[PDB]
Structure formats: structure tokens, C-alpha cells
Enzyme design. Sequence first.
Site, short mmCIF file in Angstrom:
data_model
loop_
_atom_site.label_atom_id
_atom_site.label_comp_id
_atom_site.label_asym_id
_atom_site.label_seq_id
_atom_site.Cartn_x
_atom_site.Cartn_y
_atom_site.Cartn_z
N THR A 1 0.85 -1.22 0.00
CA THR A 1 0.00 0.00 0.00
C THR A 1 0.87 1.25 0.00
O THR A 1 1.91 1.29 0.65
CB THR A 1 -0.95 0.03 1.22
OG1 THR A 1 -1.90 -1.04 1.12
CG2 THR A 1 -1.71 1.36 1.33
N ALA B 1 -8.37 -2.87 6.33
CA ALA B 1 -9.30 -2.39 5.30
C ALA B 1 -10.66 -2.09 5.92
O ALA B 1 -11.23 -1.02 5.71
CB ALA B 1 -9.44 -3.42 4.20
#
EC number: 3.4.25.1
Lengths: 212, 195, 250, 235, 243, 244, 240, 231
Positions: A1, A49
Site C-alpha cells: 500500500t 481495510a
Amino acid sequence: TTMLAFRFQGGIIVAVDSRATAGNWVASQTVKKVIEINPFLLGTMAGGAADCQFWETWLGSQCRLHELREKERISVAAASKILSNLVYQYKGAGLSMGTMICGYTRKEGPTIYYVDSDGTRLKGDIFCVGSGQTFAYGVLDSNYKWDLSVEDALYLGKRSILAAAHRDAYSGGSVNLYHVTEDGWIYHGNHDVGELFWKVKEEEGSFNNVIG
Amino acid sequence: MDIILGIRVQDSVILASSKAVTRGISVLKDSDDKTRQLSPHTLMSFAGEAGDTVQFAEYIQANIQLYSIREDYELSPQAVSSFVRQELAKSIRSRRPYQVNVLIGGYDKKKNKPELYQIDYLGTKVELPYGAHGYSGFYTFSLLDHHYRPDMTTEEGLDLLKLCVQELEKRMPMDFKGVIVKIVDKDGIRQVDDF
Amino acid sequence: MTDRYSFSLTTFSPSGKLGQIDYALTAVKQGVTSLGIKATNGVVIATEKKSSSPLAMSETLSKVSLLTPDIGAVYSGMGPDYRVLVDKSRKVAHTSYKRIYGEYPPTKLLVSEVAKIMQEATQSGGVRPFGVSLLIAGHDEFNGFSLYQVDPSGSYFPWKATAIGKGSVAAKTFLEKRWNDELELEDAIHIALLTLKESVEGEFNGDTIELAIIGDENPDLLGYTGIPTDKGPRFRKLTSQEINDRLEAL
Amino acid sequence: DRGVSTFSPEGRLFQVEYSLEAIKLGSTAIGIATKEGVVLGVEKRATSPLLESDSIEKIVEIDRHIGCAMSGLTADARSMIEHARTAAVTHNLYYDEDINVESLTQSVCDLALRFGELMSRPFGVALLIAGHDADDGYQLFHAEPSGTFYRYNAKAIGSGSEGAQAELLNEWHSSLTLKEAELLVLKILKQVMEEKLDENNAQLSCITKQDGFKIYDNEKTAELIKELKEKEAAE
Amino acid sequence: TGYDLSNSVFSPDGRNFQVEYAVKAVENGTTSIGIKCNDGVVFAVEKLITSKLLVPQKNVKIQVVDRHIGCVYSGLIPDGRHLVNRGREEAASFKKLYKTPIPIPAFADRLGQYVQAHTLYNSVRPFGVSTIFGGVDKNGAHLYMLEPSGSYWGYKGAATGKGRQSAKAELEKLVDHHPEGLSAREAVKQAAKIIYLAHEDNKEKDFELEISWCSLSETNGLHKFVKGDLLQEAIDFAQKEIN
Amino acid sequence: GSRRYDSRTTIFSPEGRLYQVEYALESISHAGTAIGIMASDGIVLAAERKVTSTLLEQDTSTEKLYKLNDKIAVAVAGLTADAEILINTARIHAQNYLKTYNEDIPVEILVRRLSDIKQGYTQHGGLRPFGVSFIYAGYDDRYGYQLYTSNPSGNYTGWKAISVGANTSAAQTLLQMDYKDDMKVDDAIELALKTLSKTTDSSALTYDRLEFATIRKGANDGEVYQKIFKPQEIKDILVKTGIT
Amino acid sequence: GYDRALSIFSPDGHIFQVEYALEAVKRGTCAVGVKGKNCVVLGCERRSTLKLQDTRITPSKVSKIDSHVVLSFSGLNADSRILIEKARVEAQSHRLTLEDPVTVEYLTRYVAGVQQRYTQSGGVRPFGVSTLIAGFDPRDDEPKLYQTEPSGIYSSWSAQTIGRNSKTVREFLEKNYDRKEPPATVEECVKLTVRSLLEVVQTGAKNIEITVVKPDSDIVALSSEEINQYVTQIEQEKQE
Amino acid sequence: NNYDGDTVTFSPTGRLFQVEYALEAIKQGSVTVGLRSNTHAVLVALKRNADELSSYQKKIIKCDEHMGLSLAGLAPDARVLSNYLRQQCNYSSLVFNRKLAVERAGHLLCDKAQKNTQSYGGRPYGVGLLIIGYDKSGAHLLEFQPSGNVTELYGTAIGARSQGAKTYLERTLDTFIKIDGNPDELIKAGVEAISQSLRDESLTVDNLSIAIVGKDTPFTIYDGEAVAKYI
């Protein structure tokens, strides 16, 4: 990420990658890591998430209740603090969150708060979070100016994620761009890293190490 | 957070606190102000676990401000430091303790005296002419033990503080990105913008 | 169910009177006379054992009660209310004092605890006041001998000598004439027996009179030897024979 | 005395019936539903000229698609509004959609009979809840302290209600425009109000699908009042 | 006065008027009975047919507790159901801890204490039912009757409701004429007769007969409803006796 | 149910008065008079015990004057038992504050706390209020010598001189007449005793019917001393001021 | 817990406990609020039935809720302390979570909400208090003045009075206060406030308190002599 | 009189006046009819409007695919009781994979209403309910009173003027019980039954509310033009 957000003359640029991994396994390349809290507020998603999605959606509900009650747009300061105070209540339970709450109001101007699951809340001009954060910072730091144009700022954010997507194994897929103004955020498209890399290599002359 | 220093001179208390905020691999910020004004003549610097530091500091600030409004009166530095100690002493036997170390620099307007209190996360309070938390004292106390005088001016205090910071910058492995320095005296709290 | 009486049953009337307390005092007035006299080297408390039936064994009914080894209590008014107060008083002497300081409470502080319990029954929800007045006699190292009265309101006062219940007005006048600050314990017992005879109609002997003293330490009542500092209780209940012996010298 | 949840010999709850009397003393509020939108209007009724009338808030936003007007003990409405706003936002959080106007109204009405010996008495305020959803279009509801809610094409509550309702009986038809409804609320408010109606002692609002809930500016309402005066003088 | 306005208040007589008023509700109810036989118990109840629209045999009144106890009551039907629900909880907890099914005298006290508890406070109302119940345990057959006050005793025969005086007189004849005892099948027949005879106090509307029984020989000590041929036989026997 | 027997202790009258508070004040008007007088160099607390007996043990007796801490004392008018409940709570509050801040509790903060407790009993809980009025005599380094009073409503006010209990109207008029701002403790002692001597319902004012206390900086140097007068000391000051 | 419904409706639709709470307000000393162009002035009556009072330590009638907002009241003094404490706590809580001090309207809305809650909660009576809340919103120079009452309703006022004889001083304010041109200076505003109290007060001595609140947390209470000069100048113009 | 202040007080004749007053609220309510055959069960309800601008108050509530009721009296109380039934039907399906028997549903409603008649502070429910359903023993119709009394019937009616419909059903008993496998004729009989309770007003398209449940018919409510066929 890899995610970044930086303040500049024209507001805020938010840029993120799109990859999600479960170990070495690439679970998705089409993940939305920018969350549209509301038409004026953006949040980035790093760590858990679900923790980021759930609580920043919840944050949008709290921001909406605020402006219903006070008849006024919520400040980025107040919005970020609602989230940081919430996660601080859960400290120790195992939430994983690294986000930048980005907004542009009258009283504040363009504002970014780094909010984190161990309770940290930092105001700042440039933030970069994720496994590829160090790569993006390098491009950002050497090219950042306050007096960047909206066009050049957008490219800088795009180019910085690309740098990370190239080197960081757990970053890639595509680049999502946003531009945050006082009248709200503006989406500036999804950019496949595969196609973007070759395009940038040719036009820029960078990545000479890579054969194309 | 990392380095917080304090020195009580003739007529003021000087607090120096590092500017760096590091989250593991990267230095996220190099201009962080690790302090809160509790009252017009009382300043508190802090260092410890991420999140808990600011949460604790702002909680204390809110409580002292509440007292100030209720009584229309500023608590003495001693009274504020005792309140802070109790909160940390209470915290250490809690479910999840505040991992926060503080320095409280205040000017007592009644006694016309500067006062520096050092309190760690256990609630260990001591009044000192100069103090620190973490490893900061290991590098700086030998210099302070040598040069410190109780009748020092504010300018001499700042010079002795510069020598301390220079020694830290030389022998400490971590880059703490310099310090923000604030002075607490009879006129209140002000920041030295060039250090 | 649930106790749904969460409101006060004792309240101020327009004249400022707390009716239920006044009425509790009226119940005390109907009660059998009890008295207390303080001497230089002791305190005596006494009352009549008004037996409800001659088939009843009045020795099984204790009107004079040990609260601590050095503190005793007697009452006038409602017997059952007294009995539960004695239970609470004995327990509070331990929970709020002996388990903290490792010693029995001084008279004035135990009285204070009993008074607090009686006060709360005057303000707490869904209860009536206690229908008793207590006379508590005791000794402790730093205050010496003392005698206290506790009323239904929770108010308490220290006395040199006093009486409560049926014939208290006449008894207090009798005590005013006889009391001085040079009385020995035996003199106080003698005066107690004289005073108590006036309010008693029927039989007047060791079986119809209950009398106890707070006086010298009784090592013979301690139950063990070997610890010099432990010298025994100062509270002692006089026997039927001991009372009758002093009724011949009456 | 007697229970707060007691039934009368006629089979009515004393406290609910008494709260209805308090609502009769309240300032007038009127709602009219059309196929172009729902209009909400209120009488402000300031007790003194020194009272700044724009601080009188008797029309309130619940969500972008739902508005609300009140009449009676207006302080009692605040927790009802808070609940309504929370219910509207919560449903959006749970279901990623707007809540139905009826469902919102039902959620508010669930609070009504939660009193006894929960709150100590019923609410002393009636609400006109107006809004739009995709399933049932433009809607107007009347929420009472009994817990009952009726849907209305048009409705008036408060002190001038029965006179206003008779007027709404004659004037409402299924082809009313939004502009026609605005003038109609103004006309009937002007009829039942003690003081002379102007932009400072009366307030208008509407809910449309496009623009959502909007409280009208005093300048905007003032023009509609002037338009009303001229068309009444036109015959 | 005012002593009858609140439950658990003693009148100057030493009476609880609220409990006495609950008895009035019981006396207003339909007739229910119980007969103790040689190796068990029989329960029967009068069910008033208020209308033709009532579905026959559907609105069952007699209730089973555990598998060996039957309960019937007169007065406020909901109050009786509430009492049986409690009884079922009591029986369940007893069997949970002690394994064996609750003995009838043990069960009687459980109901008794619960009903008595509703005479201790003004925050509750006394039960508006008298309950006839019983069954078979390890010591044999037992029949009980429980009043609003919480008072209960063991019975040879029991009756309550509007036609209780008539029923009692009939029960007393059976006790006198059968000192050796009554069989379970005889008791069912007699129960039918007594309800039919007691129906004279409720003669305006017609009624439906409902009978149940627990017998060591006839039902293996389990509570069962009298159905079909055995019920019809009892109805025929009852109809023959009234004519 | 239980509602039938509820007196409803926390309701307004049609005139907007609290019934129980008003009736509690009526009770207090029959209690022995207590007087507080504040001087530049100290405070005086004087109070009359209610019709006593010769057999009452006076030297160990306390019904009027109570110590809250070393700097603050109170004079009581009303139900003594009610007062002791509040007094113990005030003593604990003072110690809580001292533990928290390591400074003696300022007088007003203690007074406000007790007064808030009284207030609570008038607004919620359905219990009767405390039938007590206090005079607070205290010293702190912010305002110096201070006199306050509180009553069952929970309302409190500051005073230069004040009386509570019986004959407050007569007492307050006498105090208002002879009080001056530059007054000293020894003068205030005399005023307090003279006022009680005139307002008393008894035939004469004697030592056995009084409780007396002073708060003086007449403590050696920069500190404050509380003096609860002994029976013999009250007898002496009565002779000194020429009342007996 | 004590759960009794004290505030209930009557057959005519009135809640008498709330209405009787207003009667307590009627008994309280008069309070007045007047907002100028760049200030708000809070005036309060002190009843002179109590002399020998120590004015240094006696609870003052105007209370700071925060550095920028003040609250005065009429009615039960003990009740007002509970509202003041709650308001002060909420003011700090707001600063802690929103990172901005309360607006005057928000603080008013909160206090009014507390008052309303005490009119339909079991086991509690309404506050016998009406309040005047005045100040300036953060970074704003527009004067703010609000009123609350036991029922919990609140509203903004150009000028308002509460307490005993407030009918008389409201009469004065309604004819003397012009909305098109409010008291342009501090002097004019204080003068109009003192004038309004002089209609009711008695002696202009220690019976009138005046507190001036200006923008940016500038709050000051006038002394006896300063007020006495206004009292003097008003009557000397009146002798004509 | 002196004994109607609360539900916890018997009168000297053994009556519970608060419960009787709650029963009175049902009599003020609009008429609703229930009737069944051996295959189907039908509810018919006359809805009441506030005025000509207002909607007609809904009377029928679905509790499950196989069960539902109609109300008369306090509508919010019906919502509370119908919500409870929905939960109990749901508990039975989730835990036991079993459709809740209509008779057992009646027992649960009885017990819930009973608790409000024996305790201080509470009040009785002010609504009457007609529950229809189709379970493993066929079609069922129940009548609920807030006294706690629940009764299984072939047909019935509650509300104002319900006596007219009830007498009609008592006459027609032998006819409508035999209407098996013909939903339309059973509804016709219900519409004709409720017509015996009308005065001044007649059954219009927004006035009438009908519900039906049966052998191969989930509980469905008909309103608007869906009932014009039966007018």
C-alpha cells in the site's frame, strides 16, 4: 500500500495505489483506498481495510449529524478528532488504521490530519503512509513546492505513487487521484500502473534501468 | 516522543522539547510542539507512548482550564503538579496506563519564584533546578551539574541549554530534528523562535 | 415487588415539626424507666425487667447489653428496635473501627455510629424512625468514663446522670439532688437502686431489676492468661444475688 | 393522586388527552403536499418586539429529503428532532440509502407512549413531518403524542387548526403547483394569526426531490406575501 | 376505612380485604372440580359456550405441569395461566437439581408460597383464581386446592367457581357412600355428573364438558385428557342422571 | 401502590416556593441562636445551647461548634444529627482536596460543595431536606478571613456579621447597629456576647448555656489558630465583657 | 430509585410544576441584558434587605461560563449553580473535542436542553431559574444575547429582562431601545442598562451590578463608583 | 370508583376497572371481522380516516408468512404486540425450524397481556386483536382481549357495531365453514359480514382492508383497487 496527501496553493492532492495482498497473494488490484467521507472530506486507507472503511464511513455519519445540529460545515480539525478519539477508546483491542483526513474549509484552508490507531493525530503539509511510503516521500520531498499548479501537483502525486508501485512489491495496480478544493473534492481518474509506467518512462526519460 | 529538557533559572523556567515525530521507519514530522499551556503561567511538556501523550496533556489542560473558570483563579504550579501526579499515579494501576512522562514549568505569582517539576508515568514527582526524561539526562546532566547556578539569567540558561542540545546532537544516535524552546516567567509563556 | 417506597416517610410539617420523630419520642415516653449514673471510678446503668408473663423466663430477655468489652447499653421504648440496634452497634464497632485500628472504639465514637444509623432511619426512603432512646455507658483510655443518651432523631448528649422513659422527669429531679463529682461506684449503684425504686410498682429485687456497671478491668472474665496488656472487660452485669446484697444496705 | 398511564372510563389515556390540549395552545403550523413538493409554514409568534424573531426555530431539517414543523411545547420537540436525525443518519449508515418518510415518522412515534413510572410524561408537541422518497413520492405526516400518525394531503396544527383545516378542505386539489401551495399556506396563516402576517412573524419552507429541504429567506417570503396581496386585490 | 384500597394492609379485623375481593372473582368464574380416586385423581371443568362461533373442544382449560400433574382453576383465566407457568418453572428446577419429578405436596407448597407472596406487597395484586391440582407421585395420589390467600389443603374432593356449593354437596355424598374408595373410571363418570349438576347455577348458556385424569393403572401415573369414547360414555352417564 | 403515601418532598408550591425547604427553615427558627462576626484580625463564633440541665456534662459536650479542618469551623442551627452527617462529608471533602492539590481547601469551595449537597435533596431523590443552617468561619490565603451561611435550600452567602437560628431578625438589627469595618476580634467577641445576651429567650446568659470559638492569626507569626473555648474560658470572657 | 412523575399535564394542558418554577423566577432579583453595536451589558439587581454582607466573597450574580461567554439569572440561587457547573463542563468538553470554544447559541441550547430534560424526567423537579446568556462567538464581533426559562425554550433578544418587576423594565426597554440604531458605544449601552434598572431598583448604591462583555474575551465588572457616576449623571439630566 | 386508580386494585365485587376501561377502547375502535373455512382464513377490516384530507388508518399487520392479525383500539399497542408476535414466530423458525402454531401464539399473547394487569406502574394494553393463520392443523382464527383472554373461533368481530357482524356469522356458520378451495367466496362472506356493522357510510376503495391466508396462500393484505372486486 502507498498513499500520500499534500497541501499546496490550490488545495490538497490525494494519491493512492490500488493493490491488496494476503501474504504474497495479490487479492486485488482494484481497491478503493480513498474514501469519500462526504463531498468535502476525504480519507485514506492503510492498515485494516475494514477498520478504515467502517469507521470513516461512520465518521461521515457523525459529520452529517454535526452540520444538521450546528447548521455549519464541520472543520477538518473537529472531523479528524472525532475519529482519533474513537479509535483511542479501542486502543489495545487490535484496530489497525493509518489514515489522512483531508479537507478544505474557510476558517482553516486546506488541512490534512494524519490519524492513527494508536491514537496519534498530527496536522501537517505532507504525509505518506504504507509499505511503499519511503519511495513516494523521495519524489515528494525533492519536487514539492507550495506554488505548484493544480496540473503539476496532480502529476507529482501520480508520479510519487508510481515510484512506490515500481519498487514496493505490495504496491501497484492503479493510481487514483483526487484534488480537494474549498467547494469539495474532484476525482481525477484511475490510472493503470502498467500503462502509466511505460508512458512516464518514455515521456520523462526516467527508469533507464528498466528495458522497454 | 524523545527529548524533553527543563531548567529553572533565577526568574524563569525554560523547557526544551524535540521537534521530530518518528513512526518506525520514517520521520513523519519535524516541527511538532510537544507542549501544552495549562494556565497563563504554567506550561507542561511531555513524552512517551504515541497518542497517550497528547490525550493525557489535553485532558490535563481541560481540567486546569475548568478549575480556572470555576474559581476565577490560577492554581499554583505546585498545586497543578500535584493534580497531574495523582492522575498518573491513578493511571499506573488502571486497565491500560497512560505511558506519559511530563515536565511542568511554572512561575508562581504569589511567591514570585519559577518552579520546575519532573513527573514520570508512574506518578514519581520531584521538584528540580533542572530535569529531563528518557535518555536526555544521561547526556546533559554532567554539563548542568557543572555550569548551573541558581542566580543565572534567562540568557545564561539558554546558553547552557544550547550546550546541552549540542552534546545531544553529537552523541545521540537518533536525529530529533532540533528543539522548540519556551520560557515561562512572570509575564507568562513565550516561544524562542530562533534556536 | 421491589421496595417502591424510595421516598421519605418522615417530613417537616408546616410548623417545622418532624412528626414521626416526635411520635417515636412518645413511644419512648411510654417505655419502662431506665437510668444511668456516672461516678469517679465507674458508670452504672439500670432498668426494670418488666416481665410480660410470669411463665416467661425474663433472664433470657437482656435489656442491658454488652456492645464492646468496655461499653454497655440500656434502653427505653420498643424492645425489638433496641435488639436490632444492639446487633448493628456490635457489628459497626468491628467493621468501622476494630478491623481498621486493631482496638475497640471509644465510647463517644461508637455512640456516634449508632446515632448515624438512627438518623438515617429518619431520612432514608421507606422507613420509620427507631422507637427507642438509648443510654450508653463506657470507658476508654483517653476519655475515661462516660455516659451518653441517644434519641430517635439521632441526637446524642453526654450526661453525668440521667433517666429516660416512663418516670424520667421525677427520676432526673431525684438524681439532681443526689449527684456530685466525688461519687464512688458503690455510691452510684446505691443511688441508682434508690432512684429506680420510685418508678417500680410491683416486686423490687435482683430478679426484676437489671443492672450493669462499667468499672475496673475484670481479668477473671477475660478467659485467658499470659498477655500482660490484656486485663479483661470493664463491662460487668451484676448478678441477682449481688443486687439483693445491696438492697439490704438500702 | 393517580397513575400517569391511567385509562379514563371512555378508554382514553388521560395524559395523552391533556397533552393534546397543550398543542391547541401552540402557534399555528401548516403543511400542504403537492406533486411538485411539500410546503411547510409556521406562525412564529414572538412574545415581545425585542425578541429577535429569526432565532425562533419552529421549522427544522431532519435530513436532506425530510423536513419538520412543530406546534405546542416546542422545547419537547428537541429530543424528538435529535432522535429523528439520528434515525435518518443511522439508517443511511446501515443501508447506504435514504430512509422512507413513513419509516422515519414511525420511528419518531415509537417514542410517544414511552412514558410512565422512560420519561415522566408524554410530549406536549405535535409535528408535521414532510419529505420525499422514491417509493411513495412527496408525503406529509402528522405525528401526535398518542403515537398515532396520519398521512395528509394537507394539514394544520396549533391554535388556528380547525379554521385552517376547513380552509384546506376547500382549497386543496391534486393538481396544485408548488407556487400555488406557497401562497395557500401564507393565505391561511394570515387568516388565523392574531398579528398581521409579514416575513418576520411567519416562515415558509419546502421539500423538493431536486433541491431537498430548504427554509425560505425572509426576502423570498416577503415577495410571496406581496404576490398574495395583489392576487387577492385582483377580485 | 381505606383498608381495602391497598393489598397487604391489615384491616382492624386482621383481614386482607384485597384477597377477599380476589375470592369474589373466583366465585364469579365457571365451576371446576377435582376427585381423588383409588390410585389417582380426576379433574373436570365447566366451559360456558358463549356463542355458536366457539370451536368445540379447542379452547382447552385444564393444564398439565411436568408429565404427572394436572391443574384446573376458576376465576380470571389469565391469572391461572400465569400460576401454571410458574408451576412449570418450579417443577423443572426441582427435577433439574433432584432428578426425580416433583412430588405433589412439594409442588403444592411451591404454588402456595408464590401465591402467598402476592399478598405481602401493595405493588402486586392477589391471584384471581382458586386452583385445583394434583397427580401421582411415589407416595400415591394427591389432590389439592389453592386459594387467592395462598391457603391450600389436601382434599378427598374439591370444587370451586359459581356452582361450588352444589358440587361440594355431591362430593360429600361420594365420600360417605364410598369409604373404601372410588375407581378411576368411576371417578370420571362421577366428575361428569357433578359438573352437569353444578351447571344449574349457570343454566342460561349451554356448556362443554372437559375431563382429565392421572391414574397409576389407567394412565401409568401420567396426566391425560379424557377423549372420544370414554368422554362420550361419561357424558351419557351424566345426561342419564339429570333426567 | 406506594404513590399513595408519597409526600413529594421536592415540589414547588403555586407561588414557586419549595414546601419542605420553607418548613425546614421554620424548624431552624426554633434552634439556639448562633452568631458569626468577622474582624480584620480574626473571626468569632458564638452560639447558645438549648435549654440545658445541671446534669449535662458540658466539658465533653458539643452541639453547636464543629471543626471541619484546622482552618475552617462551623456553627450549627437545627437538627444536630442532620448536621453531623453533612459535617463528616465536609471533613472528607477537605481531605480529598488536600490529597489532590497538596493545599488546604479554600473556604468557599468547601461551602459550595456542602451547599450543592443540600440543593440536591430539594430537586431529586424524594427525600426530606437537611434541617440545618450553617455559619462557616474560615481562613485561606486568597480572601483571608471569611464568613458564610448556608440553609436547607442549598443557597449560600458571604457576611461580615450574621446570625442563624432563633431571633435572627432582632440579632441582625443589633449587629447592623454596632458593627464597624475596622473592628478587632476582642471587640467582636464583646459584640457577639452582648447580642446573644439581649436576644436570648433565657432569663440570663451564663457559661453553661454557651459555646464559643475564635479563629485568629493570633497564632505565633504567619499562621492561623482555632480556639474552641472551654467552659471555664467562656465563664472568664463573660466576666471580662461584664455580662456576669 | 425515586421515579415519581412530578411534572405532568393537567386537564387544561398545563404543566403546573414548570409554571410554578416560573413563579420562583418572578420572585428572584431583576436581571437585564442589553446588546450594543460592539458589546453586551448584563445588569443585575441586589436587594438591600441584606446588609452586613461581605461583597468580596458573596456569590456574584454574573458568572463566566468561559472566557468569552457569561451567564446571569433570576430565581433560585442554589438551582443556578447546578446549571452553571454543567455549562462550564460542557464548554471545556466542547473545546476538547471540537477544538473551538462554544458559540453563545450552542451554550444556550445546551443549558436550555438541561432545563427541558428536568421537565419530563422522573423523580426530579424543574429548575426555578431563567437565564440570560451573553457573549461573542469565537473570531466574531457580532453581539449575542439569549434567554432561557424553566420549560427549556430559548431565544435571542436585542434586549431582555427577567425576574421581579421585569414587566416594568421591559416596558422601558421596548420604548427606549431602537433596533435600527443600538447603543453605539460601551458608555451608551451601560447608561441604558442602568437607566432600565433605576425604574425598579430603589437606591442606585450597591443595588446595581454591571458587567460589560466585549469581543475577544474582554469581560470586566464595573465597580460601585463607576456605576455611581452613571447613577449621578442620569438623575441630573432627569431634573429638567 | 375508588378502585379504578390502577391495575393492581380489585373492586369489592372482584372487578378490575383499568382492564375494563382498556376493553372500552376496543369498543370505540373501528369494526374488523374474522372468519375461516377448512382451507383458508380471512380478515376484513373497516379502516377509519381522520378527515377527507387524511389517509385511512391501517388495521391489518403481517406477523409471518403463515400468520397475521387485525386490530381495534390503540394502534401503538397493536404495534407492540404484533412486534412481539413477529419475534416469537421468528424465534420458532430460527431455533426449531418450525412454524409457530397459531394456538401457541395465542398463549404467548395472553401471558404478555396478563403481566400488565397484575403489576404496579404499568397499564393494560388498549387494543383487541383478531389473529388468523394456517399451520400444521389447518386454518385458525383467534380473538385477543387485553384482559389476557384469547379464544379460538370459526368467526368473530370486534370494534364499534361488531355485534351485527357477529350475529350474521352466527347464522351463516354452517355455510362459510364449508367454503373450501374458494378464496373469493370466503372473502365475499366476510365482506357481507362486515356490512352488517355499517351505518351511514359504505365500503369504498380506500375504506376496505382485506387479508387472507390458506393452504397454498401466504398471508397477504389487499388494499386500494385490489378490493374493488369485492365492493
